[PDB]
């Protein structure tokens, strides 16, 4: 299953 | 032996042709098992291997809801990325993210991974300590401090160390027959004349899984590293791979040449030579 | 920036005139992702051709597999035609039985 973190540049 | 789980994200902008596209694929070694495409009518995460289908409905919703959210986020990141590099809103651009965990040949976390790229060039990468970052340029440093300031590395270390390993091990058990089975390659050397004084010997490897393999031609025991044309390992379509190595030998000298094969599916490394059947 | 695709035309199983098979065209090492690949049977294009979901290697370059169920014969020719931004014009690669 994939991660759920904030990937905002 | 060793195993790994890896997620690959690609977000491509296409000005004047709709909103940017987001695709996410998931893998366990060289076996794909999930897919998500924002460009599909009714985008949802879909199964790509027999073993993941048994996962319940809440699993597929958890996944879809994450990828839908990631579609929106990567759309914002592509806009942000234009500011950071002073780029026009007319060009097409791509953001890619690669992440996952490696399991040591026992079953505990060997190392975590998380890299990002902008237009095919490294942008930011989580360091092996799973606590710091390596930004490739001044734009990525803006992202670095935003991440440091939000302790993203913390959440990631927890995923890579916990959940990522839990699931990988879970997928590994459910897909035992294939995930944990290595198919050695079938090997043979072909011969095609290319002159009256030279001929091509080509060592083949087919039917093997996983993709990792080593092929070498030796002349009188000396590796012909700089003289061997190797093709890139390709997928057959049945889950296995193919690869070949070739060398142009002088006529009458084909016996001085040996081909060496190494694959985790073979107990011992193989040596082959051309077999002119009389 | 921009990388041109590598191309390999081959079959899933060793080729036997008469016995059914799979024609494969694997394109790799290209960037950006937009690519147009066609499987050709004596010059004209096969209709039902499938492909893998987009993915990339550790150097960020993309790769995709285009395949079509086929049945080799003595006379028939097969090729793969690829078009990508890096290409002055569409590259055509003839299928070779020994490659």
PDB file of N, CA, C and O in Angstrom, chain B residues 8-10 12 17 23 25 27 32 34-35 48 94 96-98 115-117 119-122 192 202 204 206 231-238 242 244, chain C residues 1 3 6 8-14 22 24 26 28-29 31-34 51-63 65 67 97-99:
ATOM      1  N   UNK B   8       5.927   4.245  -8.239  1.00  0.00           N
ATOM      2  CA  UNK B   8       6.388   5.201  -9.244  1.00  0.00           C
ATOM      3  C   UNK B   8       5.261   6.152  -9.682  1.00  0.00           C
ATOM      4  O   UNK B   8       4.287   5.697 -10.275  1.00  0.00           O
ATOM      5  N   UNK B   9       5.428   7.454  -9.442  1.00  0.00           N
ATOM      6  CA  UNK B   9       4.450   8.475  -9.815  1.00  0.00           C
ATOM      7  C   UNK B   9       4.971   9.272 -10.988  1.00  0.00           C
ATOM      8  O   UNK B   9       6.170   9.507 -11.074  1.00  0.00           O
ATOM      9  N   UNK B  10       4.100   9.609 -11.933  1.00  0.00           N
ATOM     10  CA  UNK B  10       4.476  10.478 -13.054  1.00  0.00           C
ATOM     11  C   UNK B  10       3.307  11.471 -13.239  1.00  0.00           C
ATOM     12  O   UNK B  10       2.135  11.101 -13.185  1.00  0.00           O
ATOM     13  N   UNK B  12       2.341  14.651 -15.731  1.00  0.00           N
ATOM     14  CA  UNK B  12       2.710  15.355 -16.960  1.00  0.00           C
ATOM     15  C   UNK B  12       1.709  16.470 -17.300  1.00  0.00           C
ATOM     16  O   UNK B  12       0.487  16.242 -17.361  1.00  0.00           O
ATOM     17  N   UNK B  17      -4.519  21.146 -23.375  1.00  0.00           N
ATOM     18  CA  UNK B  17      -5.028  19.798 -23.559  1.00  0.00           C
ATOM     19  C   UNK B  17      -5.492  19.184 -22.266  1.00  0.00           C
ATOM     20  O   UNK B  17      -5.341  17.975 -22.036  1.00  0.00           O
ATOM     21  N   UNK B  23      -0.211   9.269 -13.191  1.00  0.00           N
ATOM     22  CA  UNK B  23      -0.248   7.794 -13.183  1.00  0.00           C
ATOM     23  C   UNK B  23       0.624   7.283 -12.030  1.00  0.00           C
ATOM     24  O   UNK B  23       1.725   7.782 -11.800  1.00  0.00           O
ATOM     25  N   UNK B  25       2.008   3.547 -10.437  1.00  0.00           N
ATOM     26  CA  UNK B  25       2.110   2.092 -10.566  1.00  0.00           C
ATOM     27  C   UNK B  25       2.862   1.574  -9.327  1.00  0.00           C
ATOM     28  O   UNK B  25       3.663   2.282  -8.743  1.00  0.00           O
ATOM     29  N   UNK B  27       4.985  -1.823  -7.543  1.00  0.00           N
ATOM     30  CA  UNK B  27       5.723  -3.037  -7.839  1.00  0.00           C
ATOM     31  C   UNK B  27       6.266  -3.719  -6.589  1.00  0.00           C
ATOM     32  O   UNK B  27       6.395  -3.095  -5.536  1.00  0.00           O
ATOM     33  N   UNK B  32       4.549  -5.985 -11.516  1.00  0.00           N
ATOM     34  CA  UNK B  32       3.644  -4.881 -11.259  1.00  0.00           C
ATOM     35  C   UNK B  32       2.406  -5.431 -10.594  1.00  0.00           C
ATOM     36  O   UNK B  32       2.027  -6.555 -10.851  1.00  0.00           O
ATOM     37  N   UNK B  34      -0.301  -2.908  -9.063  1.00  0.00           N
ATOM     38  CA  UNK B  34      -1.358  -1.895  -9.036  1.00  0.00           C
ATOM     39  C   UNK B  34      -1.083  -0.863 -10.119  1.00  0.00           C
ATOM     40  O   UNK B  34       0.031  -0.815 -10.665  1.00  0.00           O
ATOM     41  N   UNK B  35      -2.117  -0.088 -10.456  1.00  0.00           N
ATOM     42  CA  UNK B  35      -2.060   0.987 -11.448  1.00  0.00           C
ATOM     43  C   UNK B  35      -3.145   1.996 -11.092  1.00  0.00           C
ATOM     44  O   UNK B  35      -4.130   1.643 -10.446  1.00  0.00           O
ATOM     45  N   UNK B  48      -3.122  -5.630 -10.946  1.00  0.00           N
ATOM     46  CA  UNK B  48      -2.261  -6.062 -12.038  1.00  0.00           C
ATOM     47  C   UNK B  48      -1.535  -7.441 -11.894  1.00  0.00           C
ATOM     48  O   UNK B  48      -0.653  -7.791 -12.705  1.00  0.00           O
ATOM     49  N   UNK B  94       7.232  17.483 -16.649  1.00  0.00           N
ATOM     50  CA  UNK B  94       7.017  16.239 -15.877  1.00  0.00           C
ATOM     51  C   UNK B  94       7.693  16.176 -14.476  1.00  0.00           C
ATOM     52  O   UNK B  94       8.878  16.483 -14.325  1.00  0.00           O
ATOM     53  N   UNK B  96       8.388  13.355 -11.481  1.00  0.00           N
ATOM     54  CA  UNK B  96       8.396  11.928 -11.215  1.00  0.00           C
ATOM     55  C   UNK B  96       8.833  11.673  -9.753  1.00  0.00           C
ATOM     56  O   UNK B  96       9.624  12.428  -9.201  1.00  0.00           O
ATOM     57  N   UNK B  97       8.246  10.682  -9.093  1.00  0.00           N
ATOM     58  CA  UNK B  97       8.636  10.320  -7.739  1.00  0.00           C
ATOM     59  C   UNK B  97       8.754   8.776  -7.662  1.00  0.00           C
ATOM     60  O   UNK B  97       7.882   8.040  -8.148  1.00  0.00           O
ATOM     61  N   UNK B  98       9.868   8.316  -7.089  1.00  0.00           N
ATOM     62  CA  UNK B  98      10.211   6.903  -6.891  1.00  0.00           C
ATOM     63  C   UNK B  98      10.392   6.662  -5.401  1.00  0.00           C
ATOM     64  O   UNK B  98      11.241   7.297  -4.791  1.00  0.00           O
ATOM     65  N   UNK B 115      13.043   9.534  -3.976  1.00  0.00           N
ATOM     66  CA  UNK B 115      13.636  10.521  -4.887  1.00  0.00           C
ATOM     67  C   UNK B 115      12.569  11.232  -5.724  1.00  0.00           C
ATOM     68  O   UNK B 115      11.549  10.631  -6.055  1.00  0.00           O
ATOM     69  N   UNK B 116      12.842  12.463  -6.145  1.00  0.00           N
ATOM     70  CA  UNK B 116      11.910  13.198  -6.992  1.00  0.00           C
ATOM     71  C   UNK B 116      12.705  13.780  -8.131  1.00  0.00           C
ATOM     72  O   UNK B 116      13.907  13.955  -7.999  1.00  0.00           O
ATOM     73  N   UNK B 117      12.070  13.989  -9.281  1.00  0.00           N
ATOM     74  CA  UNK B 117      12.765  14.538 -10.430  1.00  0.00           C
ATOM     75  C   UNK B 117      11.904  15.581 -11.116  1.00  0.00           C
ATOM     76  O   UNK B 117      10.697  15.593 -10.944  1.00  0.00           O
ATOM     77  N   UNK B 119      11.523  17.202 -14.874  1.00  0.00           N
ATOM     78  CA  UNK B 119      11.912  17.075 -16.270  1.00  0.00           C
ATOM     79  C   UNK B 119      13.074  16.126 -16.543  1.00  0.00           C
ATOM     80  O   UNK B 119      13.902  16.369 -17.441  1.00  0.00           O
ATOM     81  N   UNK B 120      13.088  15.014 -15.797  1.00  0.00           N
ATOM     82  CA  UNK B 120      14.111  13.968 -15.943  1.00  0.00           C
ATOM     83  C   UNK B 120      15.437  14.164 -15.214  1.00  0.00           C
ATOM     84  O   UNK B 120      16.420  13.415 -15.438  1.00  0.00           O
ATOM     85  N   UNK B 121      15.479  15.214 -14.391  1.00  0.00           N
ATOM     86  CA  UNK B 121      16.672  15.564 -13.630  1.00  0.00           C
ATOM     87  C   UNK B 121      16.314  15.501 -12.174  1.00  0.00           C
ATOM     88  O   UNK B 121      15.176  15.841 -11.790  1.00  0.00           O
ATOM     89  N   UNK B 122      17.276  15.032 -11.370  1.00  0.00           N
ATOM     90  CA  UNK B 122      17.099  14.910  -9.919  1.00  0.00           C
ATOM     91  C   UNK B 122      16.688  16.255  -9.356  1.00  0.00           C
ATOM     92  O   UNK B 122      17.166  17.282  -9.796  1.00  0.00           O
ATOM     93  N   UNK B 192      26.359 -16.916 -36.477  1.00  0.00           N
ATOM     94  CA  UNK B 192      25.957 -16.309 -37.736  1.00  0.00           C
ATOM     95  C   UNK B 192      27.224 -15.761 -38.372  1.00  0.00           C
ATOM     96  O   UNK B 192      27.928 -14.955 -37.769  1.00  0.00           O
ATOM     97  N   UNK B 202      26.452 -15.599 -30.383  1.00  0.00           N
ATOM     98  CA  UNK B 202      25.504 -14.885 -29.567  1.00  0.00           C
ATOM     99  C   UNK B 202      24.949 -15.780 -28.495  1.00  0.00           C
ATOM    100  O   UNK B 202      24.279 -16.762 -28.786  1.00  0.00           O
ATOM    101  N   UNK B 204      22.407 -16.497 -25.597  1.00  0.00           N
ATOM    102  CA  UNK B 204      21.040 -16.126 -25.220  1.00  0.00           C
ATOM    103  C   UNK B 204      20.638 -16.606 -23.828  1.00  0.00           C
ATOM    104  O   UNK B 204      20.990 -17.706 -23.403  1.00  0.00           O
ATOM    105  N   UNK B 206      16.789 -16.699 -21.823  1.00  0.00           N
ATOM    106  CA  UNK B 206      15.358 -16.477 -22.011  1.00  0.00           C
ATOM    107  C   UNK B 206      14.567 -17.182 -20.911  1.00  0.00           C
ATOM    108  O   UNK B 206      15.068 -18.128 -20.297  1.00  0.00           O
ATOM    109  N   UNK B 231      22.523  -6.404 -25.176  1.00  0.00           N
ATOM    110  CA  UNK B 231      21.302  -5.656 -25.376  1.00  0.00           C
ATOM    111  C   UNK B 231      20.670  -5.472 -24.011  1.00  0.00           C
ATOM    112  O   UNK B 231      20.947  -6.221 -23.082  1.00  0.00           O
ATOM    113  N   UNK B 232      19.822  -4.465 -23.889  1.00  0.00           N
ATOM    114  CA  UNK B 232      19.179  -4.224 -22.629  1.00  0.00           C
ATOM    115  C   UNK B 232      18.166  -5.321 -22.355  1.00  0.00           C
ATOM    116  O   UNK B 232      17.430  -5.763 -23.245  1.00  0.00           O
ATOM    117  N   UNK B 233      18.132  -5.756 -21.108  1.00  0.00           N
ATOM    118  CA  UNK B 233      17.208  -6.766 -20.680  1.00  0.00           C
ATOM    119  C   UNK B 233      15.745  -6.334 -20.997  1.00  0.00           C
ATOM    120  O   UNK B 233      15.259  -5.280 -20.541  1.00  0.00           O
ATOM    121  N   UNK B 234      15.029  -7.193 -21.724  1.00  0.00           N
ATOM    122  CA  UNK B 234      13.657  -6.903 -22.151  1.00  0.00           C
ATOM    123  C   UNK B 234      12.634  -7.858 -21.625  1.00  0.00           C
ATOM    124  O   UNK B 234      12.963  -8.977 -21.247  1.00  0.00           O
ATOM    125  N   UNK B 235      11.374  -7.403 -21.510  1.00  0.00           N
ATOM    126  CA  UNK B 235      10.308  -8.287 -21.007  1.00  0.00           C
ATOM    127  C   UNK B 235       9.666  -9.128 -22.154  1.00  0.00           C
ATOM    128  O   UNK B 235       9.434  -8.618 -23.244  1.00  0.00           O
ATOM    129  N   UNK B 236       9.486 -10.429 -21.923  1.00  0.00           N
ATOM    130  CA  UNK B 236       8.904 -11.341 -22.901  1.00  0.00           C
ATOM    131  C   UNK B 236       7.395 -11.110 -22.976  1.00  0.00           C
ATOM    132  O   UNK B 236       6.783 -11.150 -24.035  1.00  0.00           O
ATOM    133  N   UNK B 237       6.793 -10.887 -21.827  1.00  0.00           N
ATOM    134  CA  UNK B 237       5.363 -10.657 -21.788  1.00  0.00           C
ATOM    135  C   UNK B 237       4.670 -11.646 -20.885  1.00  0.00           C
ATOM    136  O   UNK B 237       3.527 -11.444 -20.521  1.00  0.00           O
ATOM    137  N   UNK B 238       5.358 -12.734 -20.552  1.00  0.00           N
ATOM    138  CA  UNK B 238       4.830 -13.784 -19.666  1.00  0.00           C
ATOM    139  C   UNK B 238       5.285 -13.619 -18.216  1.00  0.00           C
ATOM    140  O   UNK B 238       5.014 -14.491 -17.391  1.00  0.00           O
ATOM    141  N   UNK B 242      14.371 -11.432 -21.235  1.00  0.00           N
ATOM    142  CA  UNK B 242      15.287 -11.934 -22.239  1.00  0.00           C
ATOM    143  C   UNK B 242      16.469 -10.991 -22.302  1.00  0.00           C
ATOM    144  O   UNK B 242      16.335  -9.827 -21.987  1.00  0.00           O
ATOM    145  N   UNK B 244      20.709 -10.929 -24.370  1.00  0.00           N
ATOM    146  CA  UNK B 244      21.719 -11.671 -25.097  1.00  0.00           C
ATOM    147  C   UNK B 244      23.009 -10.871 -25.138  1.00  0.00           C
ATOM    148  O   UNK B 244      22.992  -9.656 -24.899  1.00  0.00           O
TER     149      UNK B 244
ATOM    150  N   UNK C   1      16.248  17.094 -19.577  1.00  0.00           N
ATOM    151  CA  UNK C   1      15.846  17.509 -20.956  1.00  0.00           C
ATOM    152  C   UNK C   1      15.390  16.342 -21.887  1.00  0.00           C
ATOM    153  O   UNK C   1      14.557  15.553 -21.432  1.00  0.00           O
ATOM    154  N   UNK C   3      15.666  12.725 -24.296  1.00  0.00           N
ATOM    155  CA  UNK C   3      16.308  11.447 -24.645  1.00  0.00           C
ATOM    156  C   UNK C   3      15.491  10.613 -25.627  1.00  0.00           C
ATOM    157  O   UNK C   3      14.296  10.380 -25.429  1.00  0.00           O
ATOM    158  N   UNK C   6      15.108   3.767 -27.271  1.00  0.00           N
ATOM    159  CA  UNK C   6      15.826   2.610 -27.766  1.00  0.00           C
ATOM    160  C   UNK C   6      14.675   1.700 -28.189  1.00  0.00           C
ATOM    161  O   UNK C   6      13.600   1.759 -27.583  1.00  0.00           O
ATOM    162  N   UNK C   8      13.455  -2.384 -29.539  1.00  0.00           N
ATOM    163  CA  UNK C   8      13.693  -3.813 -29.752  1.00  0.00           C
ATOM    164  C   UNK C   8      12.417  -4.520 -30.235  1.00  0.00           C
ATOM    165  O   UNK C   8      11.359  -4.446 -29.590  1.00  0.00           O
ATOM    166  N   UNK C   9      12.502  -5.136 -31.406  1.00  0.00           N
ATOM    167  CA  UNK C   9      11.386  -5.881 -31.963  1.00  0.00           C
ATOM    168  C   UNK C   9      11.800  -7.349 -31.830  1.00  0.00           C
ATOM    169  O   UNK C   9      12.866  -7.753 -32.315  1.00  0.00           O
ATOM    170  N   UNK C  10      10.935  -8.147 -31.228  1.00  0.00           N
ATOM    171  CA  UNK C  10      11.224  -9.552 -30.978  1.00  0.00           C
ATOM    172  C   UNK C  10       9.921 -10.298 -30.641  1.00  0.00           C
ATOM    173  O   UNK C  10       8.857  -9.684 -30.520  1.00  0.00           O
ATOM    174  N   UNK C  11      10.028 -11.610 -30.443  1.00  0.00           N
ATOM    175  CA  UNK C  11       8.884 -12.470 -30.134  1.00  0.00           C
ATOM    176  C   UNK C  11       9.010 -13.039 -28.717  1.00  0.00           C
ATOM    177  O   UNK C  11      10.115 -13.168 -28.180  1.00  0.00           O
ATOM    178  N   UNK C  12       7.875 -13.337 -28.106  1.00  0.00           N
ATOM    179  CA  UNK C  12       7.837 -13.877 -26.764  1.00  0.00           C
ATOM    180  C   UNK C  12       8.501 -15.243 -26.674  1.00  0.00           C
ATOM    181  O   UNK C  12       9.143 -15.567 -25.671  1.00  0.00           O
ATOM    182  N   UNK C  13       8.324 -16.043 -27.727  1.00  0.00           N
ATOM    183  CA  UNK C  13       8.864 -17.394 -27.819  1.00  0.00           C
ATOM    184  C   UNK C  13       9.659 -17.475 -29.099  1.00  0.00           C
ATOM    185  O   UNK C  13       9.430 -16.674 -30.002  1.00  0.00           O
ATOM    186  N   UNK C  14      10.603 -18.440 -29.200  1.00  0.00           N
ATOM    187  CA  UNK C  14      11.411 -18.582 -30.425  1.00  0.00           C
ATOM    188  C   UNK C  14      10.475 -18.848 -31.619  1.00  0.00           C
ATOM    189  O   UNK C  14       9.550 -19.663 -31.506  1.00  0.00           O
ATOM    190  N   UNK C  22       3.670 -14.004 -30.115  1.00  0.00           N
ATOM    191  CA  UNK C  22       3.436 -12.629 -29.698  1.00  0.00           C
ATOM    192  C   UNK C  22       4.545 -11.755 -30.220  1.00  0.00           C
ATOM    193  O   UNK C  22       5.727 -12.091 -30.060  1.00  0.00           O
ATOM    194  N   UNK C  24       6.480  -8.447 -30.065  1.00  0.00           N
ATOM    195  CA  UNK C  24       6.770  -7.466 -29.033  1.00  0.00           C
ATOM    196  C   UNK C  24       7.621  -6.329 -29.556  1.00  0.00           C
ATOM    197  O   UNK C  24       8.523  -6.526 -30.394  1.00  0.00           O
ATOM    198  N   UNK C  26       9.514  -3.242 -27.604  1.00  0.00           N
ATOM    199  CA  UNK C  26       9.858  -2.631 -26.316  1.00  0.00           C
ATOM    200  C   UNK C  26      10.625  -1.333 -26.548  1.00  0.00           C
ATOM    201  O   UNK C  26      11.686  -1.325 -27.187  1.00  0.00           O
ATOM    202  N   UNK C  28      12.441   1.885 -24.748  1.00  0.00           N
ATOM    203  CA  UNK C  28      12.987   2.324 -23.448  1.00  0.00           C
ATOM    204  C   UNK C  28      14.017   3.456 -23.513  1.00  0.00           C
ATOM    205  O   UNK C  28      14.531   3.817 -24.582  1.00  0.00           O
ATOM    206  N   UNK C  29      14.301   4.017 -22.343  1.00  0.00           N
ATOM    207  CA  UNK C  29      15.281   5.079 -22.257  1.00  0.00           C
ATOM    208  C   UNK C  29      14.906   6.407 -22.876  1.00  0.00           C
ATOM    209  O   UNK C  29      15.787   7.179 -23.235  1.00  0.00           O
ATOM    210  N   UNK C  31      12.606  10.190 -22.853  1.00  0.00           N
ATOM    211  CA  UNK C  31      12.062  11.232 -22.006  1.00  0.00           C
ATOM    212  C   UNK C  31      11.941  12.398 -23.010  1.00  0.00           C
ATOM    213  O   UNK C  31      12.870  12.630 -23.813  1.00  0.00           O
ATOM    214  N   UNK C  32      10.786  13.102 -23.031  1.00  0.00           N
ATOM    215  CA  UNK C  32       9.589  12.900 -22.207  1.00  0.00           C
ATOM    216  C   UNK C  32       8.754  11.639 -22.542  1.00  0.00           C
ATOM    217  O   UNK C  32       9.151  10.825 -23.396  1.00  0.00           O
ATOM    218  N   UNK C  33       7.617  11.477 -21.864  1.00  0.00           N
ATOM    219  CA  UNK C  33       6.788  10.299 -22.026  1.00  0.00           C
ATOM    220  C   UNK C  33       5.955  10.102 -23.275  1.00  0.00           C
ATOM    221  O   UNK C  33       5.634   8.960 -23.616  1.00  0.00           O
ATOM    222  N   UNK C  34       5.521  11.187 -23.913  1.00  0.00           N
ATOM    223  CA  UNK C  34       4.713  11.025 -25.112  1.00  0.00           C
ATOM    224  C   UNK C  34       5.512  10.270 -26.155  1.00  0.00           C
ATOM    225  O   UNK C  34       6.627  10.654 -26.515  1.00  0.00           O
ATOM    226  N   UNK C  51      -0.514  -2.511 -24.623  1.00  0.00           N
ATOM    227  CA  UNK C  51       0.709  -2.016 -24.018  1.00  0.00           C
ATOM    228  C   UNK C  51       0.646  -1.947 -22.510  1.00  0.00           C
ATOM    229  O   UNK C  51      -0.427  -1.901 -21.899  1.00  0.00           O
ATOM    230  N   UNK C  52       1.830  -1.937 -21.922  1.00  0.00           N
ATOM    231  CA  UNK C  52       2.002  -1.851 -20.477  1.00  0.00           C
ATOM    232  C   UNK C  52       1.697  -0.444 -19.963  1.00  0.00           C
ATOM    233  O   UNK C  52       1.621   0.514 -20.743  1.00  0.00           O
ATOM    234  N   UNK C  53       1.462  -0.351 -18.654  1.00  0.00           N
ATOM    235  CA  UNK C  53       1.189   0.902 -17.971  1.00  0.00           C
ATOM    236  C   UNK C  53       2.525   1.612 -17.898  1.00  0.00           C
ATOM    237  O   UNK C  53       3.571   0.977 -17.713  1.00  0.00           O
ATOM    238  N   UNK C  54       2.495   2.922 -18.081  1.00  0.00           N
ATOM    239  CA  UNK C  54       3.706   3.719 -18.073  1.00  0.00           C
ATOM    240  C   UNK C  54       4.555   3.573 -16.810  1.00  0.00           C
ATOM    241  O   UNK C  54       4.035   3.581 -15.701  1.00  0.00           O
ATOM    242  N   UNK C  55       5.866   3.444 -16.991  1.00  0.00           N
ATOM    243  CA  UNK C  55       6.775   3.385 -15.865  1.00  0.00           C
ATOM    244  C   UNK C  55       8.147   3.870 -16.304  1.00  0.00           C
ATOM    245  O   UNK C  55       8.375   4.111 -17.490  1.00  0.00           O
ATOM    246  N   UNK C  56       9.051   4.041 -15.348  1.00  0.00           N
ATOM    247  CA  UNK C  56      10.393   4.521 -15.652  1.00  0.00           C
ATOM    248  C   UNK C  56      11.451   3.788 -14.818  1.00  0.00           C
ATOM    249  O   UNK C  56      11.138   3.150 -13.809  1.00  0.00           O
ATOM    250  N   UNK C  57      12.674   3.790 -15.333  1.00  0.00           N
ATOM    251  CA  UNK C  57      13.804   3.153 -14.699  1.00  0.00           C
ATOM    252  C   UNK C  57      14.421   4.059 -13.615  1.00  0.00           C
ATOM    253  O   UNK C  57      13.901   5.139 -13.350  1.00  0.00           O
ATOM    254  N   UNK C  58      15.529   3.638 -13.000  1.00  0.00           N
ATOM    255  CA  UNK C  58      16.143   4.458 -11.967  1.00  0.00           C
ATOM    256  C   UNK C  58      16.837   5.734 -12.499  1.00  0.00           C
ATOM    257  O   UNK C  58      17.174   6.629 -11.722  1.00  0.00           O
ATOM    258  N   UNK C  59      16.995   5.843 -13.826  1.00  0.00           N
ATOM    259  CA  UNK C  59      17.582   7.052 -14.416  1.00  0.00           C
ATOM    260  C   UNK C  59      16.486   8.001 -14.931  1.00  0.00           C
ATOM    261  O   UNK C  59      16.758   8.883 -15.717  1.00  0.00           O
ATOM    262  N   UNK C  60      15.244   7.728 -14.527  1.00  0.00           N
ATOM    263  CA  UNK C  60      14.055   8.512 -14.860  1.00  0.00           C
ATOM    264  C   UNK C  60      13.485   8.336 -16.272  1.00  0.00           C
ATOM    265  O   UNK C  60      12.378   8.804 -16.550  1.00  0.00           O
ATOM    266  N   UNK C  61      14.214   7.665 -17.149  1.00  0.00           N
ATOM    267  CA  UNK C  61      13.778   7.469 -18.518  1.00  0.00           C
ATOM    268  C   UNK C  61      12.669   6.448 -18.507  1.00  0.00           C
ATOM    269  O   UNK C  61      12.692   5.516 -17.694  1.00  0.00           O
ATOM    270  N   UNK C  62      11.701   6.632 -19.405  1.00  0.00           N
ATOM    271  CA  UNK C  62      10.528   5.762 -19.504  1.00  0.00           C
ATOM    272  C   UNK C  62      10.718   4.526 -20.340  1.00  0.00           C
ATOM    273  O   UNK C  62      11.606   4.459 -21.185  1.00  0.00           O
ATOM    274  N   UNK C  63       9.802   3.587 -20.146  1.00  0.00           N
ATOM    275  CA  UNK C  63       9.814   2.347 -20.911  1.00  0.00           C
ATOM    276  C   UNK C  63       8.392   1.822 -20.975  1.00  0.00           C
ATOM    277  O   UNK C  63       7.614   1.928 -20.002  1.00  0.00           O
ATOM    278  N   UNK C  65       6.001  -1.498 -23.169  1.00  0.00           N
ATOM    279  CA  UNK C  65       5.992  -2.695 -24.019  1.00  0.00           C
ATOM    280  C   UNK C  65       4.713  -2.713 -24.908  1.00  0.00           C
ATOM    281  O   UNK C  65       3.589  -2.595 -24.392  1.00  0.00           O
ATOM    282  N   UNK C  67       2.639  -4.973 -27.601  1.00  0.00           N
ATOM    283  CA  UNK C  67       2.537  -6.331 -28.128  1.00  0.00           C
ATOM    284  C   UNK C  67       1.262  -6.679 -28.908  1.00  0.00           C
ATOM    285  O   UNK C  67       0.177  -6.177 -28.623  1.00  0.00           O
ATOM    286  N   UNK C  97      14.475 -12.389 -36.916  1.00  0.00           N
ATOM    287  CA  UNK C  97      14.266 -13.645 -36.200  1.00  0.00           C
ATOM    288  C   UNK C  97      15.403 -13.971 -35.208  1.00  0.00           C
ATOM    289  O   UNK C  97      15.145 -14.540 -34.147  1.00  0.00           O
ATOM    290  N   UNK C  98      16.639 -13.593 -35.551  1.00  0.00           N
ATOM    291  CA  UNK C  98      17.829 -13.849 -34.713  1.00  0.00           C
ATOM    292  C   UNK C  98      18.210 -12.717 -33.749  1.00  0.00           C
ATOM    293  O   UNK C  98      19.390 -12.602 -33.385  1.00  0.00           O
ATOM    294  N   UNK C  99      17.270 -11.848 -33.383  1.00  0.00           N
ATOM    295  CA  UNK C  99      17.588 -10.748 -32.470  1.00  0.00           C
ATOM    296  C   UNK C  99      16.492 -10.482 -31.422  1.00  0.00           C
ATOM    297  O   UNK C  99      15.397 -11.091 -31.507  1.00  0.00           O
TER     298      UNK C  99
END
